[PDB]
Design a protein around this ligand. Structure first.
Ligand SMILES: CO[C@@H]1O[C@@H](C)[C@@H](O)[C@@H](O)[C@@H]1O
Ligand SMILES: CO[C@@H]1O[C@@H](C)[C@@H](O)[C@@H](O)[C@@H]1O
Ligand SMILES: CO[C@@H]1O[C@@H](C)[C@@H](O)[C@@H](O)[C@@H]1O
Ligand SMILES: CO[C@@H]1O[C@@H](C)[C@@H](O)[C@@H](O)[C@@H]1O
Ligand SMILES: [Ca+2]
Ligand SMILES: [Ca+2]
Ligand SMILES: [Ca+2]
Ligand SMILES: [Ca+2]
Ligand SMILES: [Ca+2]
Ligand SMILES: [Ca+2]
Ligand SMILES: [Ca+2]
Ligand SMILES: [Ca+2]
Lengths: 114, 114, 114, 114
């Protein structure tokens, strides 16, 4: 199944934050309506916050997360969870190797802000 | 029901990261077996990261998040999500006021780490 | 925070299914747009499906689950999860007693159907 | 990533319930310790319950859900959610065709039971 793609409410500010847990250098791209809106990169095995940014879901609400390591696309897992019918989290994990921890880059999207 | 309380695997490293979205200064306390292990503070209405840290769940595995604003504990919502039977998120929102966005302080706990 | 209230897409069919795991008879009421749309009752300590039904979310999309034992409201917990940006589950647990399993009645709402 | 595999606590009862939303006949297999523990087959486009059973998780606690239609394995999506640090849901969707609803068979696993 497709993973790392989320439909947000249109024209809504959201946070996106990436964490690294791998020997490999992670590169995370965040697309909004297929336009590159953010790119984060770094290397840590201790959960470094390689990037955090406020974006806007725009007219389409379509947000996609992609992760690669020195050009190789990582396999993704994802889900969205809503608390008290209001508070939204869109979650991504990614695997760059063979141990299947899916934590090599972790991406958390949250809304609403403010 | 109790919120913001999570049983992690014993003696396991985890990340904890807090974001703020309130006019008020948020204080986030992370407790491991009922003892404060990290404290973050800050004020933002733009989802700023007010802290991030790596902790160990210790011999009991018991982790709790508490949030307070202007000397007053905030109400919490929370849940845990597991993706591909491996990647764990413990998610918390908090409400300090009247509007019920539960985003005043947003706290993300993730494990395993690298 | 409010629990057991979900916003579904308008004019969409959904399933609602209730399970019982308590010494006490559970009553589950499902409201759509503030009108009772389904009701199930039963006692089981073995996860009986005390009712399952297909409903339409109508113009509002507002769906509320209430659980009671002989007229006494149970405390609820709830969340919504979305898989592959398409498959939705709204989840409710309830506690009628002192042991805090929140499984006394468990309610699952799923959409889309068909 | 692997989907439909969940680690439950050892020697613990859980409920499994399958719903169908497809023109095709769905076959849902539940494997406990890599051996078939339940099988459900049926057809509905109205979310009918094609099986519901209580099972034990056994020594390893490893539970796997597989879905097929006309003998051809369906693609799966899944996740696990925990409410109030106690109430567990393991959730599976499956796609037998081209429309990507992942509702063709929907499987809900819940624990603890009464
Ligand atoms: C070489 O493998 C990569 O780096 C290791 C230190 C681990 O984080 C592993 O999950 C990751 O895939
Ligand atoms: C005074 O109210 C607090 O600050 C505002 C700017 C909002 O973020 C609100 O949710 C928060 O409770
Ligand atoms: C009297 O307690 C009720 O019935 C028991 C058999 C348990 O299922 C318990 O969770 C429930 O609250
Ligand atoms: C022919 O396609 C199958 O049956 C239809 C009635 C739909 O439920 C569709 O999702 C399913 O994959
Ligand atoms: Ca890895
Ligand atoms: Ca890793
Ligand atoms: Ca608020
Ligand atoms: Ca706020
Ligand atoms: Ca109980
Ligand atoms: Ca019970
Ligand atoms: Ca389908
Ligand atoms: Ca279908």
């Amino acid at each position: 199944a497709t993973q790392g793609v989320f439909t947000l409410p249109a024209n809504t500010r959201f946070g996106v934050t990436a964490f690294a847990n791998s020997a490999g250098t992670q590169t995370v791209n965040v697309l909004v309506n297929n336009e590159t809106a953010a790119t984060f990169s770094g290397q840590s095995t201790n959960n470094a916050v390689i990037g955090t940014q406020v974006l806007n879901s725009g007219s389409s609400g379509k947000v996609q997360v992609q992760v690669s390591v020195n050009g190789r696309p990582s396999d993704l897992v994802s889900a969205q969870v809503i608390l008290t019918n209001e508070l939204n989290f869109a979650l991504v994990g990614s695997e760059d190797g063979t141990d299947n921890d899916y934590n090599d880059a972790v991406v958390v999207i949250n809304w609403p802000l403010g």
